[PDB]
Amino acid sequence: ALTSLDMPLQGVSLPPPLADKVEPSKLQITTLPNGLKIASETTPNPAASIGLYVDCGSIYEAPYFHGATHLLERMAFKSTLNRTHFRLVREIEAIGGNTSASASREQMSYTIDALKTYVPEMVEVLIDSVRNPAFLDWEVNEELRKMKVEIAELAKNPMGFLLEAIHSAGYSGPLASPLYAPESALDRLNGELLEEFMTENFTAARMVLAASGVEHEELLKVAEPLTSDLPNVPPQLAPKSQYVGGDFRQHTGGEATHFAVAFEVPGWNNEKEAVTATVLQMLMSCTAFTSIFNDTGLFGIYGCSSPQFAAKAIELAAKELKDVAGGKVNQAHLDRAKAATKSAVLMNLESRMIAAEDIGRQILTYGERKPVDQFLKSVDQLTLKDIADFTSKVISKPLTMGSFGDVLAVPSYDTISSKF
């Protein structure tokens, strides 16, 4: 009203405070007869987050579907068979919501974030968008027109360019199918090519409806009539990839050689030995990266040097992996990486958006949310013996190398693979 902001406004009804100690709520999960998993968890935070996670990605493209998953991300929350794109945007804006979509190599996600009082609106708009996309041609061609520009604006970021680069160079099969498709599969992508990809891949047994901040009762009341009629289809085996090692080279000039050396680490399906990869990542634009999947992962280290100093940086990095594999790590350094690892997983976990992602992430990967507690145990149980042998076993396997920029002074794959 009229008073200054330092003075309380008279006549405001104040809700009673929440207790300083609030017992966390259990994750209720319900599986439908068609195999669709609905999982929710109640929180005292007024903000709600509802996501839909699909077991689908770039590994289901090859061949004659290259680029479908990146287009599908960009065609999210567009026109559906029941409401135009204009009305959809106006419905989300009217409740102060926000929508996001993400396409990885193995997972697709669709999330809406709004106040808890708008759960029926969020669920209805979310399910309609993923279940009944119209894929109108003028909307596809606009997203296709936008997709051209982002791919062009990708070699401005050598971190991302190289991380995509070493995935296709190191794996053979589906995991080598690029997430960013080249500008030749884009002149073939159409609305009807997207509808065939989605009708065959977006099945109820490959979906998870995960919500953070809702009651499981009414969330079932709204979601069941919109999802119960999905056909029950048998689960198909995931398309298998094989790590083989490889080399990426590309001379684009410049005076900043970018580099990535990478190795193979076990995937999420291997309990432990995937924790060690994150602790190893913390033990180490130059950094150490990690890209893990269900059954195989990739651990590597970046680097940025000069045109003529692009011979010793690689051996420099190749010396640090040898040192860790040789046992040249002190307990003070190991304990710092352990504490850094345990704190990071606990610090990202207070974000309501991430905790909802983690619910959908895990119920797709495993089928249940595994408590962070056993993860923390597997962290503090690590010894210098485990770190040294994990690296020794990791770096004795075939090597993956990536290089962008001036590559004239970078040596061969054999002249670098022999270092390990």
Partner: protein, 487 residues
């Protein structure tokens, strides 16, 4: 006989598109029963319950404020100080930014290494941020390590060594960054905007400061700055997460025993050095830059001005957008719609900055050279429209969006701690969500028009532009577009 409708390729293709149009004329009403595109002003305070923000004032004037969440595993603890570059002088400009650097560079009890090995052993994080009017040092740590983080914060704010060899090294780092990392063109536009809008005031000075000051900063200067500004009545200790108020208060009264006791408020320094807005512009023309970037600002409202809430609602009405946003052609913001439909900007953003006695309300835009003329028209047209025609729907939707954004951004111990610290410095209290929501709901269409007529109509503006900006209209064109002569 004529060919059947599916024989010629163009006849078959027309049949395919026609059939697909037919399937859009019959929506399934299962999916059309809850969501509506008409914005409704809702009132749900039952979901607004939050843990109590307990505040305690010590006899020395220090304030400790906590919002406890004992189920959480992490906590954020830190110090917010009513001090910044505004309260410096023309000879001490840059001492606050220098002090931020040196704040983690040695103590009697701990050296530079010993401090950072300890932060790493607990897996914590130390962050320091300084602005024109606020300075903050806070720690992100686990529940079991709050007392250690408070011990560290008190140690670095009361016993810092400021060794002259460290100063000279840090002097070289600061001199380097002042002349080698200036490509952050967005913050450069706002830095020049503050300098021209608040010219000849303490608020027009940059946080980083001149090189002449930086290369003359000594041990004493950092010590005098702490003595005069880091006083107990000007600092707040805020903690959020797994923290107990009584435990934290007792740690504070044990550890903060060496603060300055100067009983000078920030209201007195501001009144002694008021900040005032001057209509002016600075144009940094460089055709070698691919993109133009400009910001256009009006003098806005201070923190405690009740019209500040209306300026937040008006800022949401203008909204923000960039090329990657998907539905920009359909949002409620008419400015975003004009930009998105006609492709006249790479990005556009409305900002509302507040200070103790003034503020800035305006729009920052990135565009190509050939889009500048049309873009400048749309920006000025949509801003000026707020004084003439405000629909009830557009103000109801901006109120709903603002209420949602202010509460969806409070996810994590960190955003809650900085909220507690910032609000205690600006309002003298943490405003309950129920009250802020009530002040937002008060901003109706008549309120927006009244506030817009006070701040926008036929008012002077400040312009800060860089890049290929020859096509940008001059000051008189922007000045004229603040009123409509057809009314």
């Amino acid at each position: 006989s004529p060919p059947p409708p599916h024989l010629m390729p163009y006849d078959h293709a027309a049949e395919i598109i026609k059939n697909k149009i037919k399937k859009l004329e019959n929506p399934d009403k299962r999916f059309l029963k809850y969501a509506s595109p008409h914005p409704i002003l809702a009132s749900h305070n039952h979901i607004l319950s939050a843990p109590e923000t307990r505040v305690t004032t010590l006899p020395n004037g220090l304030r400790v404020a906590t919002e406890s969440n004992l189920s959480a595993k992490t906590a954020t603890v830190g110090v917010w100080i009513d001090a910044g570059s505004r309260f410096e002088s023309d000879e001490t400009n840059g001492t606050a930014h220098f002090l931020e650097h040196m704040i983690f560079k040695g103590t009697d009890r701990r050296t530079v290494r010993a401090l950072e090995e300890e932060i790493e052993d607990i897996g914590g994080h130390l962050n320091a941020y300084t602005s024109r009017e606020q300075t903050t040092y806070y720690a992100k740590v686990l529940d079991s390590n709050v007392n250690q983080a408070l011990d560290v914060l008190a140690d670095i704010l009361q016993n810092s060594k400021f060794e002259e060899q460290r100063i000279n090294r840090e002097r070289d780092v600061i001199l380097r960054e002042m002349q080698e990392v200036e490509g952050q063109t967005d913050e450069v536009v706002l830095d020049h905007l503050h300098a021209t809008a608040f010219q000849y005031t303490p608020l027009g000075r940059t946080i980083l400061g001149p090189a002449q000051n930086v290369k003359s900063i000594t041990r004493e200067d950092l010590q005098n700055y702490i003595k005069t500004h880091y006083t107990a009545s000007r600092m707040v200790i805020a903690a959020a997460g797994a923290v107990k108020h009584e435990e934290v208060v007792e740690q504070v009264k044990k550890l903060f025993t060496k603060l300055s006791s100067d009983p000078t408020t920030t209201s007195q320094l501001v009144a002694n050095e008021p900040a005032s807005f001057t209509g002016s512009e600075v144009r940094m023309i460089d055709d070698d830059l691919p993109l133009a970037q400009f910001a256009v600002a009006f003098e806005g409202a201070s923190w405690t001005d009740p019209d500040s809430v209306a300026l937040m609602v008006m800022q949401t009405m203008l909204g923000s957008w960039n090329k990657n946003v998907g539905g920009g052609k359909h949002v409620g913001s008419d400015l975003t719609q004009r930009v998105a439909i006609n492709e006249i900007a790479e990005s556009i953003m409305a900002f509302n900055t507040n200070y103790k006695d003034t503020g800035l309300f305006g729009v920052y835009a990135v565009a190509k050279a050939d889009c500048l003329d049309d873009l400048s028209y749309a920006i000025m047209y949509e801003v000026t429209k707020l004084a003439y025609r405000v629909s009830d729907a557009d103000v109801t939707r901006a109120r709903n969006q603002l209420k949602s954004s202010l509460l969806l951004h409070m996810d994590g111990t960190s955003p809650i701690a900085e909220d507690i610290g910032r609000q205690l410095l600006t309002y003298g209290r943490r405003i309950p969500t129920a009250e802020l929501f009530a002040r937002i709901d008060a901003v109706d269409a008549s309120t927006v028009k009244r506030v817009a007529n006070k701040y926008i109509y036929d008012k002077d503006i400040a312009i800060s532009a860089i890049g290929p900006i020859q096509d940008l209209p001059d000051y008189n064109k922007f000045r004229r577009r603040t009123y409509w002569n057809r009314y």
